[PDB]
Amino acid sequence: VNSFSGYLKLTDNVYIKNADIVEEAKKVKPTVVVNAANVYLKHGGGVAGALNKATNNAMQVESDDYIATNGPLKVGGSCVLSGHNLAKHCLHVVGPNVNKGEDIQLLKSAYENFNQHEVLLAPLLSAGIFGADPIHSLRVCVDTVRTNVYLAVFDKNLYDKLVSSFL
Ligand SMILES: O=C(Nc1ccsc1C(=O)O)c1ccc2c(c1)OCO2
């Protein structure tokens, strides 16, 4: 039993809710919140910009030190950093950005990072400003993640379309 509330159950391990991931994280304080990161951990907009703003830019400060030490992530890769005031940890995961021409096949590799964590609060990878089809992202999530994932979908219209079209 966990404290996630109001989710629709899609499969044995995948759950979904129309919610602002920032507000969800502040309420639940999950062990892991997933960020929709880029390889430079520049958290300018989309989910990343919102999560970083909620940390009063502490996420960005920590991220800049991470990059200065380690260099950029790989597309499809991840790193674990602090969750600040939102979660114990933040798993920064880089899905492919279609608006940069990146290979959508890398979306499966990106979701594989979730399997290293027993329970996660997450957005749909490569959705929103990353330009992929969110219906496809949900399909890859369900077919790749085996750990318990709670998906937060900001847009109510999109949430309804994701539920109604789910096979
Ligand atoms: O980019 C966002 N979400 C996202 C990303 C890929 S899918 C997806 C979704 O919610 O379906 C996002 C979430 C919450 C926000 C925000 C942006 O700005 C203020 O609060």
Side-chain angles (χ1 to χ4, degrees):
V1 179
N2 61 58
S3 61
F4 287 104
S5 175
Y7 286 74
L8 179 92
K9 183 170 179 58
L10 295 176
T11 68
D12 181 66
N13 65 299
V14 179
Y15 295 81
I16 196 167
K17 186 183 179 177
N18 173 220
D20 181 347
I21 193 172
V22 172
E23 295 306 315
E24 272 296 285
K26 286 193 285 186
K27 182 73 172 186
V28 174
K29 313 235 197 298
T31 304
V32 180
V33 67
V34 174
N35 182 32
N38 59 53
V39 297
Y40 307 110
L41 301 180
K42 287 309 186 195
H43 309 302
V47 168
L51 290 170
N52 176 57
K53 179 178 178 185
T55 76
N56 184 42
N57 211 51
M59 177 180 285
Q60 191 64 67
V61 171
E62 178 195 30
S63 293
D64 286 353
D65 170 83
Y66 173 92
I67 297 287
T69 296
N70 301 109
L73 296 179
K74 300 169 179 179
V75 178
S78 70
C79 67
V80 179
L81 291 172
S82 179
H84 301 276
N85 53 318
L86 303 179
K88 187 169 191 284
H89 307 285
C90 179
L91 182 69
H92 295 272
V93 180
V94 183
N97 189 326
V98 179
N99 305 316
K100 300 178 179 177
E102 292 167 352
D103 185 9
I104 193 63
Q105 310 303 309
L106 289 168
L107 187 55
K108 187 173 185 74
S109 300
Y111 273 116
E112 287 171 342
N113 295 285
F114 289 25
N115 290 321
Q116 300 296 317
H117 303 277
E118 288 196 332
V119 181
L120 315 87
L121 171 62
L124 286 167
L125 298 180
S126 299
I129 70 176
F130 281 63
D133 177 359
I135 297 175
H136 175 66
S137 182
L138 176 57
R139 188 73 260 167
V140 178
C141 181
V142 164
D143 295 339
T144 305
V145 181
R146 298 177 300 283
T147 55
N148 287 330
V149 56
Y150 290 84
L151 295 167
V153 177
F154 181 59
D155 192 72
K156 170 60 174 169
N157 286 324
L158 175 59
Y159 170 86
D160 286 348
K161 182 185 187 192
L162 286 164
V163 169
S164 292
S165 61
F166 183 72
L167 188 50

